[PDB]
Design a protein around this ligand. Structure first.
Ligand SMILES: [K+]
Ligand SMILES: [Mg+2]
Length: 228
RNA sequence: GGGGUGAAGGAGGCUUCGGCCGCGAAACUUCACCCC
């Protein structure tokens, strides 16, 4: 059998022919999350873009109102007073160009890296081959480079997410935990969607949000009307 | 229905209760792009 009984029971709960409203979906997610941990709620969308064109890629960040209920270890590389600013914002580890070494040597305990523009020359050359493969290399497009380092760190710690379409034109993002109250999930889902529409490429043709779905880490999906 | 590839989620998944699979890119699940 392709699925286990846990999952098969979940199938009973969803109507593949129904296009749910965000709120309907938000209430149903608690029931589609039966794995043995607090699953993450996800949103997926097929976009009306040509992923082959640089000017039609959809990429950006969005601060979810109620976060992801998750822990995120932030590493910040800064210069001068921004070192203080980064520590006072809560960065788990704050350093100067001298920390690139620790990582170069072994240190790999962090989930995100941010940097000020004035250390990017070093970060780029000395770390692109480590962080880059992992998609952790600081970059303006990922909102992880800036002189407003404290602000970036605060946003990330508070649950800001990144989104970038894949090469097939589909895009995906975590938007909360299945333990979230429905109302809060609805708020997060809507924020992600507005963020998405805010990134529709100027040249994209046809319907932007061709299809949108909500699901959980281990359960089935529910199609939704993004504008509900 | 059987599968591949991508991205995302993910620390657990399945079970005939013996164990099998995963915590490596890799289980499992989701949307896509494809093969049959
Ligand atoms: K999933
Ligand atoms: Mg993968």
């Amino acid at each position: 059998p392709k699925h286990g009984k846990r999952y098969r029971a979940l199938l009973e709960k969803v109507d593949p022919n129904k296009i749910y409203t965000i709120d309907e979906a938000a209430h149903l997610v608690k029931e589609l999350a039966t794995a043995k941990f607090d699953e993450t709620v996800e949103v997926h969308a097929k976009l009306g873009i040509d992923p082959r064109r640089s000017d039609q890629n959809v990429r950006g960040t969005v601060s979810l109102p109620h976060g992801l209920g998750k822990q995120v270890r932030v590493l910040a590389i800064a210069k001068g007073e921004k070192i203080k600013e980064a520590e006072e914002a809560g960065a788990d580890y704050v350093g100067g160009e001298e920390i690139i070494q620790k990582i170069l040597d072994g240190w790999m305990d962090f989930d995100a890296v941010v940097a000020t523009p004035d250390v990017m020359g070093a970060v780029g050359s000395k770390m692109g081959r480590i962080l880059g493969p992992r998609g952790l290399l600081p970059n303006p497009k990922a909102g992880t480079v800036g002189f407003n380092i404290g602000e970036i760190i605060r946003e990330i710690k508070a649950g800001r997410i990144e989104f970038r379409n894949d090469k097939t034109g589909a895009i995906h993002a975590p938007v909360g935990k299945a333990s979230f109250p429905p109302e809060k999930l609805a708020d997060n889902i809507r924020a992600f969607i507005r963020a998405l529409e805010a990134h529709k490429p100027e040249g994209a043709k046809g319907t932007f949000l061709r299809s949108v779905y909500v699901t959980t880490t281990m359960g089935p999906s529910v199609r939704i009307n993004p504008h509900s």
